[PDB]
Design a protein around this ligand. Structure first.
Ligand SMILES: c1ccc(-c2c3c(nc(O[C@H]4CCOC4)c2-c2nnn[nH]2)CCCCC3)cc1
Length: 135
């Protein structure tokens, strides 16, 4: 039946982005990828089937898809082509996603706030906020 996770399901379109270029610099994304990725207006499509959560991002730049079980590490290829080890948990209603690669780490939080899905990405001190609304 219902899970608190249901608040995330649906198709969400990017409506605002703040500081993503600098976040991508901190991650180590090269100039060209930053420019083209920063231009994109992805949709994020979230679905749940049993214990498996799937998050797909679709854009003109790249399409990505992760499927996972909360608390169970998985290997992820990011849109910028990093091969990372990821674990996603629910903490107080927030999806918390850590990506580790090459001795580096980044944390991505996904939260439902009003009718928005708010995604906060942090690496060292650099934060980006991306807001999505229902498509
Ligand atoms: C088109 C397709 C994908 C991206 C993209 C990227 C990154 N991370 C993203 O997402 C973060 C934030 C939410 O989850 C993880 C998104 C993304 N996917 N969906 N929206 N933005 C990693 C850094 C470099 C750029 C690649 C951007 C443009």
């Amino acid at each position: 039946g219902s899970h608190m996770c249901d608040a995330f399901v649906g198709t969400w379109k990017l409506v605002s982005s703040e500081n993503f270029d600098d976040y991508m610099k901190e991650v180590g994304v090269g100039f060209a990828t930053r420019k083209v990725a920063g231009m994109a207006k992805p949709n994020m499509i979230i679905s749940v089937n049993g214990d498996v959560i799937t998050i797909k991002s679709e854009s003109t730049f790249k399409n990505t898809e992760i499927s996972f079980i909360l608390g169970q590490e998985f290997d992820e290829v990011t849109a910028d082509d990093r091969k990372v080890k990821s674990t996603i948990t629910l903490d107080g209603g927030v999806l918390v996603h850590v990506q580790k690669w090459d001795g580096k780490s980044t944390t991505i939080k996904r939260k439902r706030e009003d009718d928005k899905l708010v995604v906060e990405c942090v690496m060292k001190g650099v934060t980006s906020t991306r807001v999505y609304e229902r498509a």
